[PDB]
Symmetry: D2
Subunit: 117 residues, 4 copies
């Protein structure tokens, strides 16, 4: 289902395991921005979704610090997994940078990523 | 720092531990919405933030399923921690509900929560 | 290049005139939500872009009140026009509802619409 | 209620007239960013709001081009006009900059501005 290796429209790689506890754990590697190699991710998903054809709600976070690079920023992806032959995770995301109070107004980027296996 | 009990403008309770590894673990209790009692949260923060009077970038997720209730939804908060006399976690959030294809355009609420120590 | 009829992925119809002064005027007809028939839109665009190699930044508003229906809400679309063979208006939107204080946390939906000429 | 001079938490000045036609027209001056002096705005508001205590939905745009400067960007504010302790407009906004399609992931800032009629 959710567990596996996903790619988005940028060619970023999202490697995730969906725990029985409703946890998401894995690694993110962004094709773009102030990022190199893998970053830890953690998140949550609805481990008992509706059976009415509705998607499975989920979210995860990456802080853009690893052993190579610190971009003083975090992204959260909020979305739903859509099952089937052509499984999809459809997300919107918020990317917050650590800023001074003067620059807080421009701290947060927003966008949308769709993942496929 | 980040570890401890935070309150937002809705009166919601955010209980978090900030691990040396950059992990956030804890519970969330929403004063509003399709929610009761505490929910598991997990997240990440910049464990080596800039020391320039910049905020500390962080985010976390709550899937709105616990032993009482399932709201078939998930919120992510993305924001920054500011220390000092007036400690704040300033966030914007995305709440996505599980929807049919037809209803996906209205799947996602957006808002902002400001968390304080008192 | 902006002036004319545009269609998004929901099948909504966006009819706009881009004035030489940076104005956007026209009508919006939503294929979804609490809406029927056309609604007035107004907005603004960058009428002096630096390069065709960057999108043309623009935005517009619909208040969801016309002679038929009032959905006590307003959408803003913020995005960029991309010209040429496969012309597109790539947007993110915020749909705010008039809410009681109690419901204000859930006042705003967010999404993304891609407009094409076909 | 909406017609007047407003200021947000950054000290930006929002000057707006709410027309009989549901139109918003006026000027915006940002305290921050790649902006100097006034910019045109246009938008729309709900001219027949609910009578149940609900706020009044509205939205406006500014393209960041005037006679001084061009930041090749536009902001939309989506929000509601309310009462409370005083007259308020609560908004969330999207600020889109001209980018390549490939770099659109970094095109759009998002935030929230609260306006009152108090000079900062
Ligand atoms: O550039 C960064 C860190 C890298 C962010 C990459 C983003 S996450 C959302 C989108 N999807 C994806 O797959 N890649 C992109 N942070 C910057 C922000 C401003 N200063 C640090
Ligand atoms: O209503 C829910 C579940 C509860 C969401 C509470 C939200 S998270 C963002 C904000 N901050 C806070 O402290 N509380 C609120 N899920 C669905 C049901 C229908 N609407 C969303
Ligand atoms: O449902 C409404 C009014 C109609 C909104 C339609 C939205 S605008 C964004 C998206 N793109 C498009 O083409 N159509 C849709 N207002 C309601 C919604 C929740 N309460 C107020
Ligand atoms: O910097 C700019 C143009 C100015 C934007 C000011 C923003 S609108 C939202 C917020 N509220 C307010 O009152 N002021 C700020 N454009 C830049 C963005 C990236 N490159 C062009």
């Amino acid at each position: 289902g959710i567990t596996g290796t996903w790619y988005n429209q940028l060619g970023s790689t999202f490697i995730v395991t969906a725990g029985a506890d409703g946890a998401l754990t894995g690694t993110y590697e962004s094709a773009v921005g102030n990022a190199e190699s893998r970053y830890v991710l953690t998140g949550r998903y609805d481990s008992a979704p509706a059976t009415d054809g509705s998607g499975t709600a989920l979210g995860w976070t990456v802080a853009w610090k690893n052993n190579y690079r610190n971009a003083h920023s975090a992204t959260t992806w909020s979305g739903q997994y859509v099952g089937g032959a052509e499984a999809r995770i459809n997300t919107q995301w918020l990317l917050t940078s650590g800023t001074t109070e003067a620059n807080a107004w421009k701290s947060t980027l927003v966008g949308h990523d769709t993942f496929t296996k």
